[PDB]
């Protein structure tokens, strides 16, 4: 829900590796391992701002006891993030995520990038050589040709 530990525990559940439905308690080594993997995956997605953005916060795991605690993730992206984390940590235990998990991860990543893609569509301004028509105020104000860039 609202902490990295919950996201990683949900991912491990989806693998079936460690869950109350299976009567397996998450291994602390598994905890740290998949939390580190989540850090790496979120960094790769974020791509220093040019790629997909979700609001996730990278703790630092330098001053804190552990990186896994709290996350700025939007409430709508939690499903996508923990399904993708589960898919990425599947080969760690030699398991392979079920096809439903893969499809859910694809759907979630698409939904995460939908709004960013709509925002980035924009449109380029008119070329520097394109003139304004005679029917404008800037024709009288001497602007004429459109401002470059």
């Amino acid at each position: 829900i609202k902490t990295k530990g919950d996201l990683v525990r949900a991912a491990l559940r989806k693998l079936g590796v460690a869950s109350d439905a299976t009567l397996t308690d998450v291994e602390p080594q598994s905890m740290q391992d998949a939390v580190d993997d989540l850090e790496a995956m979120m960094a790769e997605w974020y791509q220093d701002g040019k790629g997909i953005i979700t609001g996730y916060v990278f703790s630092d795991d330098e001053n804190p006891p552990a990186e896994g605690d709290d996350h700025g993730l939007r409430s709508s992206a939690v499903s996508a993030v923990f399904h993708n984390l589960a898919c990425r940590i599947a080969p760690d235990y030699a398991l392979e995520a079920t096809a439903k998990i893969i499809a859910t991860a694809k759907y979630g990543k698409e939904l995460l990038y939908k709004q960013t893609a709509i925002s980035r569509a924009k449109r380029a301004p008119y070329p520097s050589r394109m003139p304004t028509g005679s029917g404008n105020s800037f024709a009288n104000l001497n602007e004429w040709h459109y401002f470059p860039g």
């Binding site: 079936g16 439905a21 299976t22 009567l23």
Partner: protein
């Protein structure tokens, strides 16, 4: 994947010791018959119906071959079938040994003979003026007969005697003292196998046979060392004939008690781990008072053990895959089975009662005991299925004679000790012969599951091969 589940012996844990123990079928008798899709079907124990009354509780039974009638000693009154012949003192269990000219019941430490013409005589030394040898009879513990002589063992000593041929009241004229001195073990019980007087001790089982001596003073019986069995009977009444031999319970002297059978001068165990754990759960005095006997009906060879808080039954004919023990019980809770001292007379079996002063005859078309409901349990063994689902859970029941459509309580565990919700399913329908006991949507087996089938009914229940569709 229709996967069958055995029901002849159930598995589970033990919440005190944390040991895997056998959950035994209760009031059921596995019958090795090739039924439908299974190799055997569970059959409820026959019910008990009151044939007639009696004085006091039952204390012994023995089928008198000489008179071709059964002599039963209930309470303080001796009974021959329906009629009341003798008067018997005491209150504890009594050992009997029928004779051709007298029926006897060793009680209160003295062997009392009830002659067939009405008179009663007690064993005592020959008169001093007679001139025959005088012994120290002491207290009588157990009795038996072989070739016209009554053999009894002095209480608290390994010496046993034999009566005279001419006058059966007094012991033998010149040679009536015999000892099982192969070990320093007192004779816990005596009995007759073929033509041998056994001398069940506390660490040995010695034998004896007639030597045929004619001169006065010669020992009539001589030990047979080659047949000696290095075990013992725990209590005076922990022995009984079974399959042309004596089974018994080992005395604590040789180790932990365990049900044994004598074979060719050697004791072979027939008690599983759980049975001997149940036996060992008792103290020395409590387990000593246990009485064990043989009951044989239909194809089964039962070996019923009457322990103070359990009634274990060994079904010899159903021991194809290993020893098969069922715990009989009376009432809804863990009370002890009331039936005791089973004997087959005439057409139908008759049994005494531990609590009431009645005698019951086994009736096969009902399972009720003295017009009361009874509980039948069946446990399936624990089996490990991970993340599996089970939907079809069908047990073949022989629906038929009944008074109401008595439903069975079907429940499943997950840790093998404590159980979940009790689901009620109709098991018999009165006067309908083709009902199926089917339950769907059993659920998901997280790790382990074990089904307990519980039936409360006054009519026989015949459960057959249990199949579960572990999909």
């Amino acid at each position: 994947p229709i996967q069958q589940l055995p029901m002849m012996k159930g598995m589970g844990k033990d919440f005190k010791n944390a040991d895997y123990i056998d959950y035994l079928p209760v009031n059921m008798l596995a019958t090795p018959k090739e039924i439908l899709n299974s190799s055997g079907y569970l059959r409820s124990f026959p019910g008990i119906t009151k044939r007639y009354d009696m004085n006091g509780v039952s204390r012994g039974v023995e089928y008198n071959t000489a008179q071709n009638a059964v002599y039963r000693v209930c309470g303080g009154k001796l009974y021959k079938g329906e009629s009341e012949v003798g008067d018997v003192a005491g209150s504890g269990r009594v050992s009997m040994a029928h004779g051709r000219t007298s029926q006897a019941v060793g009680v209160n430490g003295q062997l009392v003979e009830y002659r067939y013409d009405g008179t009663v005589k007690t064993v005592s030394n020959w008169p001093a003026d007679s001139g025959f040898t005088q012994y120290e009879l002491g207290s009588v513990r157990d009795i038996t007969r072989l070739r016209g002589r009554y053999a009894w063992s002095k209480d608290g000593t390994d010496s046993w005697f034999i009566t005279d041929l001419e006058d059966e009241s007094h012991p033998d004229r010149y040679s009536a003292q015999y000892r099982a001195e192969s070990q320093p073990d007192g004779i816990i019980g005596i009995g007759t196998w073929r033509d041998f007087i056994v001398c069940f001790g506390s660490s040995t089982i010695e034998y004896f046979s007639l030597t045929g001596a004619t001169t006065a003073g010669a020992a009539l019986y001589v030990a047979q060392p080659s047949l000696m069995v290095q075990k013992s009977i725990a209590g005076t009444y922990c022995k009984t004939p079974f399959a042309d031999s004596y089974a018994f319970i080992s005395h604590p002297a040789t180790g932990a008690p365990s049900v044994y059978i004598i074979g060719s001068g050697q004791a072979s165990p027939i008690a599983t781990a759980s049975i001997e754990k149940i036996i060992r759960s008792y103290t020395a005095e409590e387990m000593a008072t246990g009485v064990m006997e043989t009951l044989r009906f239909d194809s089964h060879e039962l070996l019923i053990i009457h322990l103070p808080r359990h009634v274990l039954v060994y079904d010899a004919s159903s021991s194809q895959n290993g020893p098969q023990w069922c715990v009989l019980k009376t009432g809804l809770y863990d009370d002890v089975y009331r039936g005791v001292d089973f004997m087959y007379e005439g057409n139908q079996i008759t049994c005494g009662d531990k609590s009431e002063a009645v005698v019951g005859q086994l009736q096969f078309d009902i399972s009720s005991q003295y017009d009361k409901q009874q509980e039948h349990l069946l446990f399936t063994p624990l089996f490990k299925a991970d993340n599996a689902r089970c939907f079809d859970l069908e047990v073949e029941s022989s629906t038929g004679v009944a008074q109401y459509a008595d439903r069975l309580f079907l429940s499943a565990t997950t840790d093998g000790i404590n159980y979940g919700r009790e689901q009620m399913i109709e098991q018999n329908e009165p006067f309908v012969y083709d009902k199926r006991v089917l339950w769907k949507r059993v659920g998901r087996i997280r790790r382990l599951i074990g089904f307990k089938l519980r039936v409360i009914t006054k009519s026989p229940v015949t459960l057959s091969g249990c199949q579960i569709r572990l999909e």
